[PDB]
Design a protein around this ligand. Structure first.
Ligand SMILES: [Zn+2]
Ligand SMILES: [Zn+2]
Lengths: 442, 442
């Protein structure tokens, strides 16, 4: 017995088609949350037989509505949500000392953690982020709370307790090398002990990690076969800082790679100043990049050249990087990635820029690949889990104005782009993770 | 007999202070719609005597609300709103051929015009744009319809019938030189004849303007003492195309200057490729620039160096440039202007970037000056018109989540920025133009 059968239009990406619009198709969802069939509505009779459903069980979408896959945020600091949107007109250092560290440090209080984490999980779900790869804080128990919160709301997630044994600017926010190693093993073990269906722990070296701790986190990830998340070559100062602290290493990428932290389950945020040779290394190891356009521009870090990454066959997703990037919305990330690629065209760095459709793919299929999840989610193939968002361009109080020509013909050039460019949570009517409807909230 | 007395927080700009926050102040508005007084709420007793009102005529704003000035869009094509947000992933000339020109051409149909024009005026108003400087089409009667629509809704505006006697790229959309002059004289005349309180005609040379039409449009502006608006130095190809079509002249700027189209009532959009010598002329003439950041990026045009424009003491505001820029929101224009300044910092063109507060000044007081309306609007100086927007960060379904700390102390570094970076029409509770409440709509 299928949990759902939907009739209408479906918009997703494949590896040979940035955006595929499937009009008047039927889509079935098994009791276990999987995509069971997807075919033109003409095949209704044959399917009603093959799958033993009656026509009255079909939910007919409005011709104005369309489904698309859940958005995949490959990099976001859940613990930075409370001041996201505040002044960034401040040297990075002061930003860290005034906002970031005091905020994250406050997560020793379980009630502050509960407040913020509940809020950021709700907020990102209602904006269509079905999968989120979160940075939390150095606090094991609070980070465990985040995981518990994402599972309660039904969001797919990686949750990473942060690790740092270096912090000159805010000495109170950090661990001893030994405390960090121990608390990471505890965090991972207590996560796993929970038997969560769609939340997993991830090894998360923070900004300020000694070489001994680096090697030890490497070891943890290796012996437990864990995902890894970190920041890499975000800005010129951070690049110089790592050359000084690790002078024996040829580059930032080598610091991670030689310490067991650059693996085929590794995602690395930013990458603005990676070299071509470093991208080759990423390819070989099967490590991914999380493109964080808003943050890179908002904090004047630099420009990730997404075309070069693509040329090098490096896995790549989009991220939000709350709060470095001020917006919690992957729609904003799509818009900003498009613009960053435009910037490199104007500057004659590249010969072309990325299409909205290409960035739509990165925000969904691309992100899921970067997280090693493209076998389960990312587009509407058969067997994958139903992670999807129902878009109504014409919803109550829509920020979109629609005119004759928006709803017929090549809609992939009209209403669909009007949503990506101008839509917001008002257009996101329903959200599904693993076939279960998670928005509207219960 | 005062029209409104408001008690609460006021946020605006002055020429000495990018953002001034006036907490728990009192503001009076006359029946003529002028700001009669603005003072600390302790002065309530004196002011009530001074201005003969009882204290129950005072409206107390919520503690989570503040007024700021209306936003001033110094450049927008109302006639392009119907396709705003559709594909821009094609060469510029194809975009013009496929989208821009067919859409404007359609404005021969007065119902289509009414439809589109009604929608954009309503949309911009509900997003806090209290003053808009519109491009319409070459059609005189339809442009007059726009003016009448702004007047109906209460939006302060300039309306420009477009003038082009040249169009190789889309020949169905153009005028004869002679027709363009006569129909411009008629547009100006028929609009003035309306006796509009708040809308004025603006001489609008389009892209596709002969030298003969150029000098004649100048004459019309000079003898009629009219405002002028055009595009200048938007992209590298346009700069070059101008070298060819006008080999006589030194540059893009002289072309206009020598034809009486560079005056102390002139606004010029984009200016991405204006030299320093050209900015000096702008200064001497008192000509303004409309910075259109979303457009410059969306169309991969270039970057306006706003820091250099200001150094040359050229008047400058922000524009949305629908549909070149896909967003109708001046909030988006603020966000994009900040990011363009960051790009120049990142590339080391500039040693610093603009602050949100500086860009907020541009969006209001700066834009009002570019339009020559800074004596009547733009901030909360006594005697100005009450063009204002009531902001509620905690509105129903608010895109912003607030946390303890957001609404006290230096809020100019907190909620105010959160609204500016993350807010939308849901937070804009009421809009006032000339002291008249124009939003919510009757
Ligand atoms: Zn980050
Ligand atoms: Zn324009």
């Amino acid at each position: 017995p299928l949990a759902h059968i939907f009739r209408g239009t479906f918009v997703h990406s494949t590896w040979t088609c940035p955006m595929e619009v499937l009009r008047d198709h039927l889509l079935g969802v098994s009791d276990s949350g999987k995509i069971v069939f997807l075919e033109e509505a003409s095949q209704q009779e044959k399917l009603a037989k093959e799958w033993c459903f009656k026509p009255c069980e079909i939910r007919e979408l409005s011709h104005h509505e369309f489904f698309m896959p859940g958005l995949v945020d490959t990099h976001i600091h859940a613990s930075q949500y409370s001041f996201a949107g505040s002044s960034i007109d401040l040297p990075l250092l002061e930003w860290l000392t005034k906002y970031t560290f005091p905020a994250e440090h406050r997560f020793q209080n379980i009630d502050f953690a509960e407040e913020v984490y509940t809020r950021v999980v709700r907020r990102t779900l209602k904006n269509g982020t079905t999968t989120a790869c979160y940075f939390a804080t150095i606090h094991t128990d609070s980070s465990l709370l985040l995981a518990d919160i994402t599972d309660k709301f039904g969001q797919r997630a990686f949750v990473g307790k942060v690790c740092m044994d270096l912090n000159d600017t805010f000495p109170e926010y950090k661990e001893t090398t030994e405390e960090s190693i121990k608390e990471t093993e505890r965090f991972v073990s207590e996560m796993l002990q929970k038997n969560y269906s769609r939340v997993k722990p991830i090894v998360t070296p923070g900004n300020g990690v000694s070489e001994t701790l680096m090697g030890e986190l490497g070891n943890i990830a290796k012996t437990r076969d864990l995902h890894i998340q970190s920041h890499i070559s975000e800005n010129r100062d951070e690049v110089e800082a790592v050359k000084n602290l690790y002078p024996s290493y040829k580059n930032y990428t080598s610091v991670y790679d030689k310490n067991n932290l650059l693996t085929n389950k590794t995602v690395m945020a930013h990458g603005c100043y990676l070299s071509a040779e470093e991208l080759n290394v990423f390819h070989e190891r099967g490590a991914s990049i999380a493109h964080c356009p808003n943050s890179n521009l908002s904090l004047s870090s630099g420009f990730l050249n997404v075309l070069e990454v693509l040329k090098h066959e490096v896995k790549i997703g989009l991220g939000t990087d709350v709060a470095g990037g001020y917006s919690y919305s992957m729609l904003d990330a799509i818009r900003r990635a498009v613009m960053v690629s435009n910037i490199l065209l104007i500057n004659k760095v590249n010969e072309k820029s990325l299409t909205l459709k290409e960035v739509f793919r990165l925000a969904t299929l691309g992100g899921s690949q970067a997280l090693g999840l493209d076998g389960e989610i990312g587009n509407f193939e058969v067997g994958k889990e139903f992670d999807a968002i129902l878009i109504n361009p014409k919803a109550s109080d829509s920020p979109i104005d629609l005119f004759y020509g928006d709803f017929f013909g090549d809609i992939s050039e009209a209403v669909i782009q009007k949503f990506l460019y101008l839509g917001d949570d008002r257009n996101i009517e329903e959200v599904y993770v693993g076939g279960k409807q998670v928005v509207p909230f219960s």
